[PDB]
Amino acid sequence: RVNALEQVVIPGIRAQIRFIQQVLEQREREDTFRLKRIKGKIEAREAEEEGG
Amino acid sequence: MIQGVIQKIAGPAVIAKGMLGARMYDICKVGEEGLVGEIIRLDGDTAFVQVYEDTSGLKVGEPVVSTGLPLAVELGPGMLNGIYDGIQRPLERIREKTGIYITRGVVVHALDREKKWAWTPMVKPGDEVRGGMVLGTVPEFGFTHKILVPPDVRGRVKEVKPAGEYTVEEPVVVLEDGTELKMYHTWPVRRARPVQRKLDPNTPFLTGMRILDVLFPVAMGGTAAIPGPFGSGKTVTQQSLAKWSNADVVVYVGCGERGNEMTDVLVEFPELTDPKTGGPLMHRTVLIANTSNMPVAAREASIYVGVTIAEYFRDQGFSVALMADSTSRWAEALREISSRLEEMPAEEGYPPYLAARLAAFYERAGKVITLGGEEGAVTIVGAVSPPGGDMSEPVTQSTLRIVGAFWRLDASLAFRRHFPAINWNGSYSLFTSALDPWYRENVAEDYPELRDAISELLQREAGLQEIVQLVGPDALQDAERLVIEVGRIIREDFLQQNAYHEVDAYCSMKKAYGIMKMILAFYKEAEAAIKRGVSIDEILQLPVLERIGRARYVSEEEFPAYFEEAMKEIQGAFKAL
Amino acid sequence: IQGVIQKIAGPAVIAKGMLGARMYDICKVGEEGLVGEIIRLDGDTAFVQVYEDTSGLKVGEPVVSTGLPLAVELGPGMLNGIYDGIQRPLERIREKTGIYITRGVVVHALDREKKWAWTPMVKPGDEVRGGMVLGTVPEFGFTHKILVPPDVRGRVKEVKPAGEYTVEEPVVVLEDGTELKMYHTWPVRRARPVQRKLDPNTPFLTGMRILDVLFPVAMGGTAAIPGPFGSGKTVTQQSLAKWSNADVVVYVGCGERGNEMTDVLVEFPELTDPKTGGPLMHRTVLIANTSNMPVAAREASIYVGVTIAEYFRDQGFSVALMADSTSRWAEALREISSRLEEMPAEEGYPPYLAARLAAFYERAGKVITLGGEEGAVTIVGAVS
Amino acid sequence: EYTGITYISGPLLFVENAKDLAYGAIVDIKDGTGRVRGGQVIEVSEEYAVIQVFEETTGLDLATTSVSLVEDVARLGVSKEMLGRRFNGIGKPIDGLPPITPEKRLPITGLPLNPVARRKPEQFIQTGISTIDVMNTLVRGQKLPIFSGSGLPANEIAAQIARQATVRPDLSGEGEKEEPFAVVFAAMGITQRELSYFIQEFERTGALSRSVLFLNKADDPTIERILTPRMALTVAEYLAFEHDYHVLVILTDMTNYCEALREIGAAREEIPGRRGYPGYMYTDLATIYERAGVVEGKKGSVTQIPILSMPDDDRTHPIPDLTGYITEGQIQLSRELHRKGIYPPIDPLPSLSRLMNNGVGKGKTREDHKQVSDQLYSAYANGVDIRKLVAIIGEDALTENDRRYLQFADAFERFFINQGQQNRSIEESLQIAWALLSMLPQGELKRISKDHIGKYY
Amino acid sequence: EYTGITYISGPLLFVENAKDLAYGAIVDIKDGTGRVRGGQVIEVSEEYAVIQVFEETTGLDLATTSVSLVEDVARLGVSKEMLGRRFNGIGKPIDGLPPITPEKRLPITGLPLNPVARRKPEQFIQTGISTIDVMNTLVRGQKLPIFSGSGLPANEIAAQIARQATVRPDLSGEGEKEEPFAVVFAAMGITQRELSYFIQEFERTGALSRSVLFLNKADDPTIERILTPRMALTVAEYLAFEHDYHVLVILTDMTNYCEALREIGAAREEIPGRRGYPGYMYTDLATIYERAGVVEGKKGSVTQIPILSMPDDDRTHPIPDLTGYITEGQIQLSRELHRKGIYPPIDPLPSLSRLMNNGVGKGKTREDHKQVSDQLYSAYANGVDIRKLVAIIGEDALTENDRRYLQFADAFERFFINQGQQNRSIEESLQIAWALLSMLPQGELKRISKDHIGKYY
Amino acid sequence: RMALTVAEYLAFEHDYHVLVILTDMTNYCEALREIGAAREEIPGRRGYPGYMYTDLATIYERAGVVEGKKGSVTQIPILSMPDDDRTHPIPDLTGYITEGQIQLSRELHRKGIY
């Protein structure tokens, strides 16, 4: 059990959280980028009242 | 007046221009066939119209004339027996006047005025009336479907029509206040019917399964919820309030129930007969559910027009069981709003309005005495799913797990034979310290004691479970397999129940009481078996374990005499051996 | 300059009437003069990052600006001197506002209302060397050498005899013109010039055997102590600086705890030096920020101290800087960069985190100055 | 012919001088490649409109652009006789002869079917795979997606259902062989092998004179991957309902669907909201699946069989997500039985079923597999699960009792789940099934009744 | 007027002549349905403001829109007669008595206390509990979170211990008649049960004649949610610092508060932080726990206790991460205790106060308390590991010492952790301890002094 | 890229062989990433530039042997791993780019091998 644990199990049960984490995290680049372009629209709209 | 035409038609939504006088969250008439919109934003003379029916031919320069009602639900009789929409349009009238296909721009009466209903007055012309007072009793089947005075309206009577049929539109009591009380009356869907006070839940609701009460108790006047990832038994768990509930008023409403699931479940009610009523199951089911064949924006309306219907019933003085079939569907519909309006929702794919309109739905009605002196109790059960398959998200925490009961499902769990299935540990009930009074007095003064005592054993086996999957038992002892086998029997017969069979479950005190006493017996004696020198191997091989394994098929009526003969066999096939 | 408020979103303010505004410029927004700072200009308007929260501020007010870039204040009074992350004296705040703090507070950054000692260590007709000799202040710590800042090597006129002179009072002026007073202003975002950066070669005592004798980092290291405080770890941090061979200690935190961080402050005069034999408080600079402290207080935290140690370095003192809660420093920065166009892109933190992280260690260590004096800025990085 | 571009990139164009266009309208256009393409007015605007071309832009100059409102609504000519003919996503017949004359020109958007107009079906069919016709019971007007991984076959298994699809003659108590049985196809993205592979098993079927094929290739535009689905199903509606025939519709490559769905997802205005895919996705998988259902007053039916091909074996992936919920009763394929050589490689252990005692297993559907389904479940489970539990507890450790569990695993799976070119009738199933069930003594066989046991002894 | 409307996305409203109006104001808006609505005036421009309606989102119209400027600065009147009042939410009559009396005006948003005038704790509170007075030691003026789960009920174990608490500082030499006690409860998102279950218990024994209540209903919008703690925080100030009272803040479910915030910020053009939760949180969470503590020269102090919910109690969630820096020490409720039915669920093992020596000292809690706390720690902990060895190897095959360490754990849950609503003193809890420890020999007593062993067994 | 181009001159033309001993590419990614975070090339792959390879293309291009001229230019990248795992782009993308790899592990570090 000792032998086994220090190899396949333990860091493997780690790398699972890590892999998960990173992909959850990176997904939220697209969130911000989209949200950016959303912002751009909103301001662009109130900038046609006062200009072009 | 409110007038204007279509500026930019994009998706099911229409963005209007020229809107003058338009007010927020108010019903409209849209296009030229009548599709009915809602003002869900203003920006001066443009207002984003959200159109509940999908668009398909509508174009620029077409009418947009708002009615000026605050998406009012039309309250009156004819609710019982008859399918309706989540947007409240009777499906009876659609099928007969179109065809078998749902077409856009079908507009018919929300509350039929192609019906009349026998009037019995009660109120006298010499009296005054009060908000929340009974004007007479309309007889709708075996139920008592009173007629009440809309809250915030009173006067002094001067006439009251005498008995006869009258159309719901015609008055039946008139007043000196410039008004006429009709059986056709507006109440907003954004404003709740007023309550006299809130009461503390203290009677439990019997949801007639021996695992959705006995182990995790649910309250009457409560709120509860069950989830279900990716079709694990999300739809099936309402076959457990189909008729094994104690409600006198059953409201089946779905945010979106797909086509295949109304091929069996929706047709199930005119093909059944409820035993509590003594009469038909559809007499006592309102039906105001929405299909997914029905447009995406009709899914968003659903909830607020059926919750008020639930209040209308609660007021009369009847137990109301409201259950929103897959409440998860209103969230996608709400979430589509953002896309179309140029906004971006709450991060990680969560809907843009979280707590605000979820907490509101649940607490709209629930354990409240009325203006009119009657006992209102609303039992609401959200049958959500996590869209991404995570049971850790805002909307589960705020109002789907902080309620009376929280439950869970696994995927190979339900497949063995548990329909529906629950996680023994990971599932709790918050309300359980307030459901102890009635259970003490009515059932027995050891019903609250035995139900905590069964739950203890069920969750203590978990202790060993882990080690089994770590390196195993290489040593079987007398104290080992004790908890382990017992608990086995308990998960095998007490949590494997079916909702498709009336012998595997049913609403009955005595069945729950009974089964749980048999298991108590087997358990009791086992602890004193081992001490004497009785191998757990032989404990399996008593036929009495099999006697408790044939209590989940037993006929309901037969059970009393059955139970009494069987309690004796345990105690005889233990103390002897 | 002087301008007018246009928007208020959040704690931040945005105000036009700015033009010819410097970058990292002194801003005192409103008629309340909330301690703020001009940043990244846009159009004929600017974005203004206001440390202190705004909630009484109305738009359209006058905004007074100095028109000179914010700098760190360096003079006497710093040894045995309590200050925060804006660098105001937290106890003269207690006397002039009471127990509670009501925002828009501005007081001098050093004790300038005292009359401080002086002795001339130069005369007229001689030339000064930058980073060294001007005149010393005798204090009850050791001494504190009030030296002229770098690149000022010119001739001096009029050096006044040893006595007592306020910080704002002059004792010296230059023959070639350009006047100077005992208080000196040095840029927050720049570090002083050196001649070599040396190599570390004098061991850094910590006063407990195992710590330094087994694992030395010597004088000019960079170390770390991980795991959160409250495990009795704080034992290590106090005693470290307390025993350790130096002549000045600077203690600094940022996002540190509640009451546990106020135990430290009162127990600080109750720590005792081995060299002087009296309190450590005599020869300690505080610039700690708690966590009730303003938004960007904690974010500016670091930089202050760095600079301040370099002053004591140039003098020929050994300093011992203790960077508590490096991990919690990042909290503020995330918040600020969210509300701007420096949005997250790394992994739950902005990618300008690594940039602001480095410089704190890069600009410290054991090196020789323009003044030719040695001293060290040993850092111990409690990440926590 | 309206000229004046503003944005062109992909099958989404924007062009001005418009307000005469309606939602869902056939226009035509001109391009610089000297060709006339298509366009559905998916969205409409103040003095422009969003157009969706039925072909990829590979050339379109700003000197020459055109718009001509052909028709106000958008439609396809559909007639009674079109069986025996092949078609493509454009909607031209690929046969080589003049295009047939309509009877109705029905919209391609789709008209939903009333939930009131249906009623519970109960007439079962032979799929030629035992496992389905016992456990889930595939009846008319019911969906049953066959979940398929990526790196897994999808084509192989599909073919088995197409040549062994057949009503019971009176094994259920009746037939529907008295009315013509026919099949409809429509592929949404197919390569070089999948093209011919399907066609040569349809000559096995003997059906190529009574089937309607709406083949969409990957050399065919990417925009027609989501047009064709709706389109195909309207030619289902026409022939099952209004000409009373039991039509089997089989939809495959609902991952190539999802590729095209994604495109419009982010390239249009709308933002992602289903973990990096659209939020109007729901409607896109609703309008598709919810059409199908046996209607009460009609003899005929649209039986839809979705065949997925979803990326890997994730279950958080958009596709299996929504699909799960939608369908009532499901079937899965995995890689447990695809390393053994067992075609099909159905695995019901993680799989789920929601209709098997819900108007099925009772009614005009036999009750003699009623208790069998319930039994097979917990019995098959005892199997698979402990195969895992053995490698932890010991390396060969299994007790008297658990020995039996695992004994019934290897056996059931081999015999039963290898069908393929072998057809088993309702009777043939149950016989064999009970004889593997005799491996467990009485007490695990509590669920089967006294009758059942002897019945199929 | 203030006419001009642009965006009513949800509970937004814009108004012209935003230059008189300010940031951090609160205002009456006039609408044609006759409704009176507050709403803080946020994101002000010189043309456009943002106001956020304290009543629903229905009745806003573009015909009647006006704004009565109340006062630009955040306001809220404070009274000293708040010591027997009862109020829900912001501060609205549930006692039927006037809401406020102006004896002073303090905002709900200011800048907390100098640390130069912050004293440390030196007294103690008795909640009448064991484990939160022995193993972890809460004292007068202390920061200390109670980490609950969402599966678990936050809310019960909150109001239980609420009314139950009666200060006791006899041993220090200060009475209950030279120490007043004020219990402040501020909740949010409470259901219909929870909203009535509280008021009842509070009214039961006197805990509402010597306390003031707050609890923000679930029918109320998410904008009022936020002001709820900031409200009761500011009241706690005017009592303890300015009349010498010792208050106890009990916040309940922090998550709901942070959810709400997120929607305000998203419409105030900011990006949320990690796990999709607010990143502008750090500051706001700080001011609520850092505007409590002791004061130099004032005997009073606000003691801070928040309660939060966590889906699985992990640290991966932002919700504990943030908190855990600004607060000292930790209490956390685990699943294992609660399931079996033990109240409170508090496990002493994940827990540890960071301050227990910088609170009370020797002779103020009896001198033996100190070492008897690190006895019981090690005695318990040893036994929760041989409960999963109670039947593998057994306890009959185990040492004498370890056999006692089993039974010890069991009696610890029964008698020490659990006591329900019964009260206890420092002295009666140390009594329990001794009895349990007599069972262990003197040879197994090594975590106390020779003085302590000879003090009692 | 300065070190690189500079060397190409002296390398081929003057005919002297040199070996460019390049150290931590970590600090390369780090600094690079900031820039694309205000011009909106949105760096991320796992939180490191997704435009990484693009820039490293020219920089590591001269690392083989030319024909004609003698002397050449050879890259020797030297960089740590934040984890053993080859998932994160610090070793992963670098892997693909360059010609094979040589790890020193920690498997012998642990023992006192040097």
UniProtKB/Swiss-Prot annotation, chain A:
BP GO terms, sorted: proton motive force-driven plasma membrane ATP synthesis
GO molecular function, a single term: ATP binding
Keywords carried by this UniProt record: ATP synthesis, Hydrogen ion transport, Ion transport, Transport
Role this protein plays: Produces ATP from ADP in the presence of a proton gradient across the membrane.
Family membership: Belongs to the V-ATPase D subunit family.
Protein known as: V-type ATP synthase subunit D
Organism encoding this protein: Thermus thermophilus (strain ATCC BAA-163 / DSM 7039 / HB27)
Gene: atpD
Residues of the full protein shown: 160 to 211 of 223
UniProtKB/Swiss-Prot annotation, chain C:
Disulfide bond residue pairs: none
MF GO annotations: ATP binding; proton-transporting ATP synthase activity, rotational mechanism; proton-transporting ATPase activity, rotational mechanism
Task of the protein: Produces ATP from ADP in the presence of a proton gradient across the membrane. The V-type alpha chain is a catalytic subunit.
Keyword Transport part of the UniProt annotation: yes
GO biological process, one term: proton motive force-driven plasma membrane ATP synthesis
Source organism, top-level taxon: Bacteria
EC number: 7.1.2.2
Protein name: V-type ATP synthase alpha chain
GO CC term, one of those recorded: proton-transporting ATP synthase complex
Keywords from the named record: ATP synthesis, ATP-binding, Hydrogen ion transport, Ion transport, Nucleotide-binding, Translocase, Transport
UniProtKB/Swiss-Prot annotation, chains D, E:
A biological-process GO annotation: proton motive force-driven plasma membrane ATP synthesis
Keyword Ribosomal protein attached: no
Keyword Nucleotide-binding: no
UniProt-listed InterPro entries: ATP-synt_VA_C, ATPase_a/bsu_AS, ATPase_F1/V1/A1_a/bsu_N, ATPase_F1/V1/A1_a/bsu_nucl-bd, P-loop_NTPase, V-ATPase_su_B/beta
Keywords noted in UniProt: ATP synthesis, Hydrogen ion transport, Ion transport, Transport
Disulfide bonds, paired cysteine numbers: none
Residue ranges of coiled coil: none
GO function terms (MF aspect): ATP binding; proton-transporting ATP synthase activity, rotational mechanism
Superkingdom of the organism of origin: Bacteria
Function: Produces ATP from ADP in the presence of a proton gradient across the membrane. The V-type beta chain is a regulatory subunit.
NCBIfam families cross-referenced by the UniProt entry: PRK04196.1
Family that this chain belongs to: Belongs to the ATPase alpha/beta chains family.
Record's protein name: V-type ATP synthase beta chain
Source organism (scientific name): Thermus thermophilus (strain ATCC BAA-163 / DSM 7039 / HB27)
